[PDB]
Point group: D2
Chain length 251, copies 4
């Protein structure tokens, strides 16, 4: 029973259901596994290859948990609706959203800016979050949470040719605050502001060296913070945009 | 008059804060090209006041979310006055209060376009014509820092994007061009605030023209709070 | 063995040693117990009554852990030296410092300010942290961490008559950043910025009501964040000042 | 000259940034009481320049960490000029680079006193004499926002305290008195920065006098970055 108490305490998300978008990428898959490790049911969106999503589902099921994956474009209203509908049909509720959909898309200077590029960056980073939050609200429970993935770029403008990306992440940071007020006390809303993370998805040695921690971050680093913020261990934290950048920027 | 010989574009010059910026710029000697969206009354009377005092200005109606109107304003500015020394972009607005639960894409996009896309379009259009030592001033909001008021989540998001973009462009466009924005609180366009009043368009214009001027040559990438002490950053 | 794996994973601070100052107060005692719950040895400073420190030590020992308590004034160089000396003599190392010493002392307006009051507030909140960090540095290991207790007051100036308190907490916030750079990569340094917390020590209904979470925070809320930041789960977070204020302020 | 008839105290007016603030204030018509710590050469020549242009100023040597010297400066200001309309506190400094591992209480306290306690003493001394619509300008630093440079942890801490105190006093002292501070980056008293140069004392003085003036009437509790785009807030 010393065990049973340990298991009970460790599995604090047992009985709860999470949606992770962008299980598509490294940070997303790490978040999926971190949520499941504490007992959450997980519905996994991915955009392109299903390889990492399928294997995450299989790992979760082998450990006695429950998950499924679904391809979709989170900039599309129909795909957003389908993901949430299938999540509720399968699990009956939604307790947390971790939205890892996003991206730089391309490096484009303002002098060469096109509306197509600007709109595409806004939609994948910001509109996708708007759509998912809207879709989830009818289903979220007392004590629910939303975790967004912003960036250090929201705080410093971003890197060369990334001005659209920075803008979209700054918008997400502000929206996190607006929604924390609009949706509390029922729902908490927080976002992460990662620095340089070593992933398939993002795009160097400089920055690792210049950083106080002398390394790039990992997807697992980010997942630990995401799940902390999603959990009841962060019950008095809402509207926060938490820097996870190895000491490269302070706020 | 340190802006003598210099050329300013003010968008949203109809137009409480915009109109105040127009007059402050002209008072320091700038030629001013004025955009307004709808009624011309305030823009036209500003032009008449400026001309009566020996200055130069014109007013042109246009929608700053439209590429053709953005191009027309900058083209006329360059033909009448020459190169652009400063852009003060006062186009923006909440449009309507709507909760996230009932958000539509149409509304979201509209708020993004009037507050943010319009700024992108104007900066892009101005860049080839901007002088050495020129500047851009954006109009953000306290809402960028605190998320905004009830039903204003889209508006807050658009202003937060503008704040970050200010930083991004300060790096991309320096040293040739400085980029700063203002973060106004409650403007009268109260006694909970330390200053115990609402701000005025003139308060905001004074900060805008300071940031536009050479007196702010070592300030770039700033988002300056002008909110009567209601919020600190 | 499914147990043993669970125990191994849950006790991530096993073999490590923490110093908590201000086990004296609610937040401090909660931090003590949260650290011990994950396996840390804990050395506990308290200023006045030993009641809560003694009972924490007894609870930890009953659960198979190790801790001791020691009265001391963390504004005094001799007491600071004695605490660290006794910690190292007992446990052989120091892996984390959680510094909960601090306080408003009294409400004093600037017009009525005295150097005595100003100095007293600076010393209990800021100088005490300087002394403890300095004392710990010869003993800290690869992968060590420091957690300070700042305040929402550092970000907004604080409440009526609390201008000295706010100043001391803003200093601590900045110092957190300076030390994250000076001491990394060996040591991470982060602080918490709590809003309204329901404790013996702090000093109301307004603020609870006005807050997005519609309540005051608890000592346990703060302890969860403190131990997250002290742990390897925050390995890519340094120089952060994390808001835990129920959504009353955003940064 | 909008500061005609108004009285300013500048501490640290010896004194690169301080001296520049003195001249900028006098150029807009202010009477200026000038503190300097040691050599009088820069303060005295500023007084002579101001007087030669028909203005009014005096210079008084004193240590702004000492209660008696703080009292003497404010007393003489009130006797010669009357009530205080603005305080620009430029007293401060790094003193020395020292790592935390080798920190002494003496050094820590010295840095706190010259940067922070001095400001506390001057504000307290000025309060009974400050006018309706008066202002305080502190000199913080980029170091308050990023922790400061190598061996400067004490200096950063003292400037971070000043930034927060600015907010606290903006609330406590409003609406009668506005309180703002400056957060300068590298001042020449570089090509990594967006503006590709170091700042000048004059850059800082222009911002200081803006914040001291009625042109900043709706700005209080601000800590304004003036760092050439090296840091954003
Ligand atoms: Mg020039
Ligand atoms: Mg007045």
């Amino acid at each position: 029973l010393g065990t049973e108490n340990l298991y009970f305490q460790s599995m604090d998300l047992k009985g709860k259901t999470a949606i992770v978008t962008g299980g598509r990428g490294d940070i997303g898959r790490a978040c999926v596994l971190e949520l499941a490790a504490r007992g959450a049911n997980v519905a996994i969106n991915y955009m392109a290859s299903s390889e990492g999503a399928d294997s995450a589902v299989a790992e979760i099921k082998a450990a006695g948990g429950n998950a499924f994956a679904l391809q979709g474009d989170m900039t599309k209203e129909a795909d957003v609706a389908a993901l949430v509908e299938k999540t509720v049909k399968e699990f009956g509720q939604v307790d947390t959203l971790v939205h890892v959909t996003g991206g730089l898309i391309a490096r484009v200077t303002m002098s060469e800016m096109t509306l197509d590029h600007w709109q595409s960056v806004m939609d994948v980073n910001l509109t996708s979050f708007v759509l998912m939050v809207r879709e989830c609200l009818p289903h979220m429970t007392e004590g629910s949470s939303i975790v967004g993935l912003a960036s250090q770029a929201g705080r410093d403008g971003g890197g060369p040719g990334a001005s659209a990306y920075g803008a979209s992440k700054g918008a997400l940071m502000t929206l996190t605050r607006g929604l924390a007020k609009e949706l509390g006390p029922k729902i908490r809303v927080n976002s992460l502001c990662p620095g340089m993370i070593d992933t398939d998805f993002h795009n160097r040695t400089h920055v690792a060296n210049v950083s106080p921690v002398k390394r790039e971050g990992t997807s697992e680093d980010v997942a630990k913070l995401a799940v902390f913020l999603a959990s009841d261990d962060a019950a008095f934290i809402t509207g926060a945009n938490v820097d996870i950048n190895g000491g490269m920027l302070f706020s």
